[PDB]
Design a protein around this ligand. Structure first.
Ligand code: NA
Lengths: 261, 102
């Protein structure tokens, strides 16, 4: 499909420690910089606020932010989690690599197959299932319709294999005009018109094996975070027009899961 | 034809070798007893065969606009996956690096 993230650059960069600024490099960097796209609007500000919303609901999110590039526009940065200390690296593999797909077939999978990758490779699958549930609800609520196989990764850190910290989380729905789907990979065979029972019963109980108390607690976390999400969006660097689109989609997705009833 | 050293955190782990017929082979080193190149390629087995370019190594290549930047910079065929991996192999995602044999 036409992906919003395909038309944006990912530039390697070093943090000049003595100043508070980044130097773009071709190789051997510790940060990624994502400047404006000429194809889709406000992707850096969109990514910066979305990654902050994820952090507010308790997902694992690395250092990220915005900086000014030469042309006065804003550029997003993320601190790489496969780079640590002095020239040390952590193993990191995306789910296309782990399931035998490639860049051309990275949408040719399902949430059920994503679960199976976690069960096969993660040290504590049941713990990562809780994380995947929160992540999938989050992506539905903020309009991230581009969670294909290369946007899930497993990290090896401290001799534990788990789902990596967040990367590339973006409200891609409001960024593009004729959005085709809600989920990049189908769940119960569905990529559009997902319902509360798809997520809370089929996904959370039948496929992830979560207990009803755990499900209920996570849903309550999302209910509780909506006022703070609304506030954070209002204070973001998105334009007023893009803030309104972000808030309107969030409200629609919240209403679809009966948050306000 | 073309072979390449595959290393993990700087330690040589094995050889990615291209065979005739578009097939590929990865072979671990006896001396290597560290973390696997990929979770799909445990040290338990020392040889791995592929009828196409192996998805683990294909997954290190750039995409989208950054692939077009790579093909703007280098005289390389659009589908020479192994050659592109050699070009970017000094620094890719994760702990693995790829260096061509001669
Ligand atoms: Na509009």
């Amino acid at each position: 499909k036409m992906s919003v993230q395909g038309v944006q650059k990912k530039l390697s960069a070093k943090l000049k420690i003595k100043e508070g600024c980044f130097e773009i490099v071709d190789q051997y960097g510790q940060y990624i910089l994502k400047p404006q796209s000429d194809i889709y609007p406000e992707l850096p500000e969109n990514e910066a606020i979305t990654m902050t919303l994820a952090k507010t609901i308790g997902l694992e999110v690395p250092v990220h932010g915005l900086v000014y590039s030469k042309d006065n526009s804003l550029t997003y940065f993320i601190k790489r989690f496969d780079r640590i200390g002095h020239n040390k690296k952590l193993a990191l593999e995306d789910f296309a690599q782990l399931s035998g797909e490639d860049r051309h077939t990275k949408y040719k999978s399902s949430m059920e197959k994503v679960i199976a990758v976690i069960e096969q490779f993660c040290t504590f699958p049941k713990i990562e299932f809780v994380k995947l549930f929160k992540l999938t609800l989050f992506n539905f609520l903020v309009g991230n319709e581009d969670m294909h196989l290369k946007n899930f990764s497993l990290i090896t850190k401290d001799r534990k294999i788990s789902i990596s910290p967040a990367y590339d989380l973006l409200n891609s729905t409001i960024a593009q005009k004729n959005t085709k789907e809600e989920l990049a990979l189908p769940l119960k065979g569905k990529k559009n018109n997902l319902t509360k029972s798809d997520f809370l019963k089929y996904f959370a109980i039948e496929k992830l094996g979560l207990n009803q108390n755990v499900i209920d607690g996570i849903v309550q976390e999302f209910h509780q975070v909506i006022p703070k999400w609304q506030e954070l969006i209002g204070f973001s660097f998105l334009s007023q027009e893009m803030q309104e689109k972000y808030l309107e989609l969030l409200e629609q997705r919240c209403k679809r899961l009966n948050f306000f009833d | 034809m073309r072979k390449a050293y595959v290393s993990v955190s700087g330690i040589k782990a094995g050889i990615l070798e291209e065979l005739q017929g578009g097939t590929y082979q990865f072979t671990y080193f006896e001396d290597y007893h560290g973390a696997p190149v990929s979770l799909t390629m445990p040290l338990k087995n020392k040889v791995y065969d592929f009828d196409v370019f192996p998805p683990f190594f294909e997954g290190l290549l750039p995409e989208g606009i950054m692939l077009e930047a790579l093909l703007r910079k280098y005289k390389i065929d659009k589908n020479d996956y192994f050659g592109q991996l050699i070009l970017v192999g000094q620094d890719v995602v994760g702990a693995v690096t790829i260096e061509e044999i001669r």
